[PDB]
Design an enzyme around this catalytic site. Structure first.
Site, PDB file in Angstrom:
ATOM      1  N   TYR A 112     -10.021  37.398  14.507  1.00  0.00           N
ATOM      2  CA  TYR A 112     -10.941  36.639  15.330  1.00  0.00           C
ATOM      3  C   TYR A 112     -11.343  37.422  16.564  1.00  0.00           C
ATOM      4  O   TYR A 112     -12.537  37.590  16.817  1.00  0.00           O
ATOM      5  CB  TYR A 112     -10.276  35.314  15.739  1.00  0.00           C
ATOM      6  N   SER A 129     -15.427  36.184  24.396  1.00  0.00           N
ATOM      7  CA  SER A 129     -14.094  35.775  24.817  1.00  0.00           C
ATOM      8  C   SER A 129     -13.345  36.838  25.566  1.00  0.00           C
ATOM      9  O   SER A 129     -13.559  37.990  25.345  1.00  0.00           O
ATOM     10  CB  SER A 129     -13.340  35.538  23.503  1.00  0.00           C
ATOM     11  N   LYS A 168     -15.154  39.230  17.692  1.00  0.00           N
ATOM     12  CA  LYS A 168     -15.961  39.013  18.885  1.00  0.00           C
ATOM     13  C   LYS A 168     -16.352  40.314  19.557  1.00  0.00           C
ATOM     14  O   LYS A 168     -17.494  40.495  19.995  1.00  0.00           O
ATOM     15  CB  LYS A 168     -15.236  38.108  19.911  1.00  0.00           C
TER      16      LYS A 168
HETATM   17  N1  LIG Z   1     -12.815  26.870  22.426  1.00  0.00           N
HETATM   18  C1  LIG Z   1     -12.295  28.040  22.804  1.00  0.00           C
HETATM   19  O1  LIG Z   1     -11.134  28.151  23.274  1.00  0.00           O
HETATM   20  C2  LIG Z   1     -13.036  29.299  22.654  1.00  0.00           C
HETATM   21  C3  LIG Z   1     -12.562  30.519  23.403  1.00  0.00           C
HETATM   22  C4  LIG Z   1     -13.536  31.653  23.360  1.00  0.00           C
HETATM   23  C5  LIG Z   1     -14.673  31.623  22.638  1.00  0.00           C
HETATM   24  N2  LIG Z   1     -15.091  30.479  21.869  1.00  0.00           N
HETATM   25  C6  LIG Z   1     -16.285  30.565  21.040  1.00  0.00           C
HETATM   26  O2  LIG Z   1     -17.228  29.628  21.488  1.00  0.00           O
HETATM   27  C7  LIG Z   1     -17.972  29.133  20.367  1.00  0.00           C
HETATM   28  C8  LIG Z   1     -17.802  27.632  20.387  1.00  0.00           C
HETATM   29  O3  LIG Z   1     -16.421  27.338  20.253  1.00  0.00           O
HETATM   30  P1  LIG Z   1     -16.073  25.766  20.130  1.00  0.00           P
HETATM   31  O4  LIG Z   1     -14.774  25.539  20.837  1.00  0.00           O
HETATM   32  O5  LIG Z   1     -17.254  24.938  20.504  1.00  0.00           O
HETATM   33  O6  LIG Z   1     -15.820  25.586  18.554  1.00  0.00           O
HETATM   34  P2  LIG Z   1     -16.369  24.604  17.491  1.00  0.00           P
HETATM   35  O7  LIG Z   1     -15.585  24.837  16.217  1.00  0.00           O
HETATM   36  O8  LIG Z   1     -16.242  23.176  18.019  1.00  0.00           O
HETATM   37  O9  LIG Z   1     -17.910  24.929  17.437  1.00  0.00           O
HETATM   38  C9  LIG Z   1     -18.384  25.852  16.436  1.00  0.00           C
HETATM   39  C10 LIG Z   1     -19.466  25.144  15.675  1.00  0.00           C
HETATM   40  O10 LIG Z   1     -20.036  26.148  14.770  1.00  0.00           O
HETATM   41  C11 LIG Z   1     -20.249  25.556  13.525  1.00  0.00           C
HETATM   42  N3  LIG Z   1     -20.232  26.661  12.503  1.00  0.00           N
HETATM   43  C12 LIG Z   1     -19.168  27.401  12.131  1.00  0.00           C
HETATM   44  N4  LIG Z   1     -19.509  28.383  11.273  1.00  0.00           N
HETATM   45  C13 LIG Z   1     -20.888  28.253  11.101  1.00  0.00           C
HETATM   46  C14 LIG Z   1     -21.846  28.965  10.315  1.00  0.00           C
HETATM   47  N5  LIG Z   1     -21.580  29.984   9.496  1.00  0.00           N
HETATM   48  N6  LIG Z   1     -23.122  28.520  10.321  1.00  0.00           N
HETATM   49  C15 LIG Z   1     -23.448  27.413  11.090  1.00  0.00           C
HETATM   50  N7  LIG Z   1     -22.633  26.692  11.839  1.00  0.00           N
HETATM   51  C16 LIG Z   1     -21.370  27.146  11.827  1.00  0.00           C
HETATM   52  C17 LIG Z   1     -19.089  24.573  13.360  1.00  0.00           C
HETATM   53  O11 LIG Z   1     -19.421  23.577  12.342  1.00  0.00           O
HETATM   54  C18 LIG Z   1     -18.985  23.979  14.801  1.00  0.00           C
HETATM   55  O12 LIG Z   1     -19.894  22.863  15.053  1.00  0.00           O
HETATM   56  C19 LIG Z   1     -17.376  29.833  19.096  1.00  0.00           C
HETATM   57  O13 LIG Z   1     -18.087  31.059  18.878  1.00  0.00           O
HETATM   58  C20 LIG Z   1     -16.004  30.214  19.602  1.00  0.00           C
HETATM   59  O14 LIG Z   1     -15.464  31.350  18.851  1.00  0.00           O
HETATM   60  C21 LIG Z   1     -14.363  29.275  22.015  1.00  0.00           C
HETATM   61  O1  LIG Z   2       1.194  24.317  21.583  1.00  0.00           O
HETATM   62  C1  LIG Z   2       0.955  25.137  22.455  1.00  0.00           C
HETATM   63  C2  LIG Z   2      -0.287  25.801  22.692  1.00  0.00           C
HETATM   64  C3  LIG Z   2      -0.371  26.740  23.635  1.00  0.00           C
HETATM   65  N1  LIG Z   2       0.712  27.054  24.445  1.00  0.00           N
HETATM   66  C4  LIG Z   2       0.546  28.034  25.530  1.00  0.00           C
HETATM   67  O2  LIG Z   2      -0.520  27.692  26.417  1.00  0.00           O
HETATM   68  C5  LIG Z   2      -1.352  28.826  26.839  1.00  0.00           C
HETATM   69  C6  LIG Z   2      -2.771  28.601  26.393  1.00  0.00           C
HETATM   70  O3  LIG Z   2      -2.637  28.706  24.966  1.00  0.00           O
HETATM   71  P1  LIG Z   2      -3.961  28.558  24.090  1.00  0.00           P
HETATM   72  O4  LIG Z   2      -3.595  28.713  22.649  1.00  0.00           O
HETATM   73  O5  LIG Z   2      -4.716  27.313  24.348  1.00  0.00           O
HETATM   74  O6  LIG Z   2      -4.981  29.717  24.540  1.00  0.00           O
HETATM   75  P2  LIG Z   2      -4.765  31.273  24.742  1.00  0.00           P
HETATM   76  O7  LIG Z   2      -4.817  31.559  26.184  1.00  0.00           O
HETATM   77  O8  LIG Z   2      -3.497  31.714  24.051  1.00  0.00           O
HETATM   78  O9  LIG Z   2      -5.951  31.881  23.990  1.00  0.00           O
HETATM   79  C7  LIG Z   2      -7.230  32.012  24.572  1.00  0.00           C
HETATM   80  O10 LIG Z   2      -7.856  33.188  23.948  1.00  0.00           O
HETATM   81  C8  LIG Z   2      -8.005  33.097  22.484  1.00  0.00           C
HETATM   82  C9  LIG Z   2      -8.646  34.421  22.006  1.00  0.00           C
HETATM   83  O11 LIG Z   2      -7.740  35.524  22.344  1.00  0.00           O
HETATM   84  C10 LIG Z   2      -8.866  31.904  22.085  1.00  0.00           C
HETATM   85  O12 LIG Z   2      -8.930  31.829  20.668  1.00  0.00           O
HETATM   86  C11 LIG Z   2      -8.195  30.630  22.656  1.00  0.00           C
HETATM   87  O13 LIG Z   2      -9.048  29.504  22.390  1.00  0.00           O
HETATM   88  C12 LIG Z   2      -8.060  30.796  24.179  1.00  0.00           C
HETATM   89  O14 LIG Z   2      -9.360  30.949  24.771  1.00  0.00           O
HETATM   90  C13 LIG Z   2      -0.609  30.039  26.337  1.00  0.00           C
HETATM   91  O15 LIG Z   2       0.228  30.521  27.419  1.00  0.00           O
HETATM   92  C14 LIG Z   2       0.198  29.482  25.109  1.00  0.00           C
HETATM   93  O16 LIG Z   2       1.440  30.202  24.979  1.00  0.00           O
HETATM   94  C15 LIG Z   2       1.967  26.452  24.301  1.00  0.00           C
HETATM   95  O17 LIG Z   2       2.921  26.773  25.029  1.00  0.00           O
HETATM   96  N2  LIG Z   2       2.001  25.500  23.295  1.00  0.00           N
END
Ligand SMILES: NC(=O)c1ccc[n+]([C@@H]2O[C@H](COP(=O)([O-])OP(=O)(O)OC[C@H]3O[C@@H](n4cnc5c(N)ncnc54)[C@H](O)[C@@H]3O)[C@@H](O)[C@H]2O)c1
Ligand SMILES: O=c1ccn([C@@H]2O[C@H](COP(=O)(O)OP(=O)(O)O[C@H]3O[C@H](CO)[C@@H](O)[C@H](O)[C@@H]3O)[C@@H](O)[C@H]2O)c(=O)[nH]1
Ligand SMILES: NC(=O)c1ccc[n+]([C@@H]2O[C@H](COP(=O)([O-])OP(=O)(O)OC[C@H]3O[C@@H](n4cnc5c(N)ncnc54)[C@H](O)[C@@H]3O)[C@@H](O)[C@H]2O)c1
Ligand SMILES: O=c1ccn([C@@H]2O[C@H](COP(=O)(O)OP(=O)(O)O[C@H]3O[C@H](CO)[C@@H](O)[C@H](O)[C@@H]3O)[C@@H](O)[C@H]2O)c(=O)[nH]1
Ligand code: NA
Ligand code: NA
Ligand code: NA
Ligand code: NA
Ligand code: NA
Ligand code: NA
Lengths: 338, 338
Positions: free
Chosen positions: A149, A124, A153
Site C-alpha cells: 500500500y 500519505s 502511493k
Molecule cells: N483514511 C486514512 O487513514 C488514509 C491515510 C492516507 C491516505 N488515504 C487515502 O485517501 C483516500 C481516501 O481514503 P478513505 O479513508 O476515504 O477510504 P475509503 O475506502 O472510505 O474511500 C475510498 C473509496 O474509493 C472507492 N474505490 C476503491 N477502489 C476503486 C476503484 N478501482 N474504482 C473506483 N472506486 C474505487 C471505494 O469504494 C471507496 O468509496 C484513499 O486513496 C486512501 O488510500 C487515507
Molecule cells: O487497534 C489499534 C490500532 C492502532 N493502534 C496504534 O495507534 C496508532 C495509529 O495507528 P493507525 O493504524 O490508525 O495508523 P498509523 O499511524 O499506524 O498509520 C497511518 O499511516 C498508514 C500508511 O503508512 C495509513 O494506512 C493509516 O491509515 C494511517 O494514516 C499507532 O501508534 C498504532 O500502533 C493501536 O495501538 N491499536
C-alpha cells in the site's frame, strides 16, 4: 468549478464533497462501491445543500473515465479512489498495485485524452518511510514504505511527477495525509468500515459502542512520553476543507504542489483513548499487546508550508475528533443502510 | 521446459529464444511487434534448430495472457517485453508506466490465474541509482533511477518482491542487465533499432556502415582513465545463456533471486570505439560533445554471485562484441525485412 471526485462516496471523499458543494462547485462522484454504499449519497446532497451527480464505475476503466471527463466538462479531478488496508496489501499485493498504481494511471491517461490538467491526489506520510527526523517536512527526500500500500502511493507520486514534467501545463497537488479521524458534526456522516477496523479511532469507537471487548494497544515500550505510539491525527472536516482550498487555489497553477495535511502535533494512543472516554461518558476498555509489526514510535507533520502557501491550518481539536466520531457511531451504530 | 518468452522477437529475447530451443525447451513467443518484425521468426527457428510458437499480442491483455499460459501449459515465463528508450520515457512517461508497470502487472496477474509460478524478469543496473560504490553488488540497497524508464524497472522489481512474499511458492529471478551488445555469431540475427539508435554500440555501427557521420562522445572530462564514460558491456549471447541457466536452475526454487548480469569489468567509450575500428577495418569517425544529461562517469557489475550460485560467467570478449555487431550490421544493412 466542475470537479470529478473519485472515491467520492468513501470516508474522506464524502466529507470533501459536502464542503465542495457548500462552496458552490459542481460535483460528479465516481465510485465503484467496493468500500462504500449508495446510501451515503442522499446524505452528501442534504449536508452539502446541492446535488452531486453520481456515476458508479471503476477508475481502471479508462474509456469510461474519458467519457465522464468530457461529458461533464470537468475542470479538475480529486482522486481519493483506491484500496488502503495496509495488512491486506501485504497479503494481496497485486490488487493494491492494480487499484492504486494502474488505477491512477488509467485515470490520468483518460485526463490526457480529455484535456483535463488539474489534479489532486490522496497521498500519505507513508511516503517518508522510516524517517528518524520528525516532524516530516515536504523538503525531505522520500523513503521506502514497508507495505505494498505505502509503496503504491509513492509510485503514484513519482508517476505524477514525471507526467507533470512531460506536460508542464498540468497542476498536480500531492496531499500527504497523516491520520484522518472524525466525522461531520451532524453525526449523520462518518467513517463506516466493514469488518474489523484497522485504524485506532474506529476501533476505539466500536469498543465504546459495545461491539468489541477491548482495545489492544500495540506496544507500551516505545521511547515516547507514555510508552505508546505517537501520531498526527487530523479531523476529516479540516482535511475536507484543505482539499477545497487546494483545489481552488492551485487550479491552473502549473507544477507539482506537495503539502503535508496534518495538525502538526503528535498525540499518543493513550491520549486518543482518554479523549474518547471523555467523549462517550465511560472509560474505554483497553489492554497492552505487543508492538505491531513495522510501526514507528512517533511521527507527526510539519504543516507550515500549507499554512504559508494556502493559508490553511487545522481548526478542530482532538476532543472534537473524538466527540464527532462518537456522535456518528452512536447515532448510526449500523452505519449506512444497505 | 515449456516457456513463454514475452518480447521474444526483440533483441535480447530473440537470442535467448535461439539458446533455449538449442537446449530443447518448448518456446512460445509473445510480442506485439512494436519494436520488432515477424521477419526474425524464421531466423530464430533456423538458428535455434526447432520451431518456436509465435503469438502476436500485448502483455497488457490479461485475458489473452491467461489463455496462452493455460493453452500452452507454460511452466515458466521470461519477461523481456516493454518499452526501453530512456529519453523517450522522459517525454512520454505514461506510455512507459503503462507498458512496463501495468504490462508486467497484467502478465503476473494472468500467471496467478493460470497457476504459473516461475518468472524471470528483465531488470537493469539503473535500479542501483546514483551509487558511488562500484562495482555494483546485489546486496546494495536500490537507489532512485532518474528516468521514468529506470523507475518503472525498480517499481516492477518491488511489485514482484511483494508478490513473492504473498505467494511464497513462486520463484522469481530479477536479472539486472548492464549494457547488452553484440549479435549472434552467424551475423544473421542482431539488434535492429528503428531510427536513431540510443545506445553506443549500434550508433557506432551505423557510423561505420556509412549511415551516420560521426559518433558524438558524450563528455571527455569524466574522472576516468581517458576522460570518457566507463560501462560494463556484455555480449547478448552471454546474456542469452545466462537466462537459460537461470531458468533451468531456478525453476521451482522459491524466492526472489537477484543477479547482476554483466562482464564484471568496465570499458570506456574510446575502448569500445577502438574495438569497433579494429573490427570494421577503418577508423570510426567521432567527436567530443557535451556530457549527456544524468549520465554517471563510471560503473560496472560485480558478477560474483551469479558465478557462485549459477556457475555462470561471460565468455565472449569486447572484440567479439564489436566483431559480431559489425558482421550483422554489414551482412544486413537494412536489418530485418518488412
Ligand atoms: N483514511 C486514512 O487513514 C488514509 C491515510 C492516507 C491516505 N488515504 C487515502 O485517501 C483516500 C481516501 O481514503 P478513505 O479513508 O476515504 O477510504 P475509503 O475506502 O472510505 O474511500 C475510498 C473509496 O474509493 C472507492 N474505490 C476503491 N477502489 C476503486 C476503484 N478501482 N474504482 C473506483 N472506486 C474505487 C471505494 O469504494 C471507496 O468509496 C484513499 O486513496 C486512501 O488510500 C487515507
Ligand atoms: O487497534 C489499534 C490500532 C492502532 N493502534 C496504534 O495507534 C496508532 C495509529 O495507528 P493507525 O493504524 O490508525 O495508523 P498509523 O499511524 O499506524 O498509520 C497511518 O499511516 C498508514 C500508511 O503508512 C495509513 O494506512 C493509516 O491509515 C494511517 O494514516 C499507532 O501508534 C498504532 O500502533 C493501536 O495501538 N491499536
Ligand atoms: N538493451 C538494453 O540496453 C537493455 C538494458 C536493460 C534492460 N533491458 C530490458 O530488456 C528487455 C529487452 O530489451 P531489448 O534490448 O531486447 O529490447 P527490444 O525493444 O528489442 O525488445 C522488447 C520487445 O518487446 C516487445 N514489446 C514492447 N512492448 C510490448 C507489449 N506491451 N506487449 C508485447 N510486446 C511488447 C517489442 O515489440 C520488442 O520485440 C526490455 O525489458 C528492456 O527494458 C534492455
Ligand atoms: O551516442 C552515444 C551513446 C552513448 N555514449 C556513451 O556511451 C556509454 C554507454 O551509453 P549507453 O547509452 O549505451 O548506455 P548507458 O550505460 O548510458 O545506459 C545503460 O543503462 C540504461 C538504464 O539506466 C539502459 O537504458 C541502457 O540501455 C544501458 O543499459 C555512456 O558512457 C554514454 O555517455 C556516447 O558517448 N555516445
Ligand atoms: Na518534454
Ligand atoms: Na474493512
Ligand atoms: Na452496516
Ligand atoms: Na501472506
Ligand atoms: Na527506435
Ligand atoms: Na530496416
Amino acid at each position: 468549478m466542475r470537479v470529478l471526485v473519485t472515491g467520492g462516496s468513501g470516508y474522506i471523499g464524502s466529507h470533501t464533497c459536502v464542503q465542495l458543494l457548500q462552496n458552490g462547485h459542481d460535483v460528479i462522484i465516481l465510485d465503484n462501491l467496493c468500500n462504500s454504499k449508495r446510501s451515503v449519497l442522499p446524505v452528501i446532497e442534504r449536508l452539502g445543500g446541492k446535488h452531486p451527480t453520481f456515476v458508479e464505475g471503476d477508475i481502471r476503466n479508462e474509456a469510461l473515465m474519458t467519457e465522464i471527463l468530457h461529458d461533464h466538462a470537468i475542470d479538475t479531478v480529486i482522486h481519493f479512489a483506491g484500496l488502503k488496508a495496509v495488512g491486506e496489501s501485504v497479503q494481496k499485493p497485486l490488487e493494491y498495485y492494480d487499484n492504486n498504481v494502474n488505477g491512477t494511471l488509467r485515470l490520468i491517461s483518460a485526463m490526457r485524452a480529455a484535456n483535463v490538467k488539474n489534479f489532486i491526489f490522496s497521498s500519505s506520510a507513508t511516503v517518508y518511510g522510516d524517517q528518524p527526523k520528525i516532524p516530516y517536512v515536504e523538503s525531505f527526500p522520500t523513503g521506502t514504505p514497508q507495505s505494498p500500500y505505502g509503496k503504491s502511493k509513492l509510485m503514484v507520486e513519482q508517476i505524477l511527477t514525471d507526467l507533470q514534467k512531460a506536460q508542464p501545463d498540468w497542476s498536480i497537488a500531492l496531499l500527504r495525509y497523516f491520520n484522518p479521524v472524525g466525522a461531520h458534526p451532524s453525526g449523520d456522516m462518518g467513517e463506516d468500515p466493514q469488518g474489523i477496523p484497522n485504524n485506532l479511532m474506529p476501533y476505539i469507537a466500536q469498543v465504546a459502542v459495545g461491539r468489541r471487548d477491548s482495545l489492544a494497544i500495540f506496544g507500551n515500550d516505545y521511547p515516547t512520553e507514555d510508552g505508546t505510539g505517537v501520531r498526527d491525527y487530523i479531523h476529516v472536516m479540516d482535511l475536507a476543507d484543505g482539499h477545497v482550498v487546494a483545489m481552488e487555489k492551485l487550479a491552473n497553477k502549473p507544477g507539482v504542489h506537495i503539502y503535508n495535511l496534518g495538525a502538526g502535533v503528535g498525540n499518543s494512543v493513550l491520549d486518543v483513548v482518554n479523549a474518547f472516554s471523555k467523549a462517550c461518558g465511560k472509560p474505554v476498555n483497553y489492554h497492552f499487546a505487543p508492538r505491531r509489526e513495522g510501526d514507528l514510535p512517533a511521527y507527526w507533520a510539519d504543516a507550515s508550508k500549507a499554512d504559508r502557501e494556502l493559508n490553511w491550518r487545522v481548526t478542530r481539536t482532538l476532543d472534537e475528533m473524538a466527540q464527532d466520531t462518537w456522535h456518528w457511531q452512536s447515532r448510526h451504530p449500523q452505519g449506512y443502510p444497505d
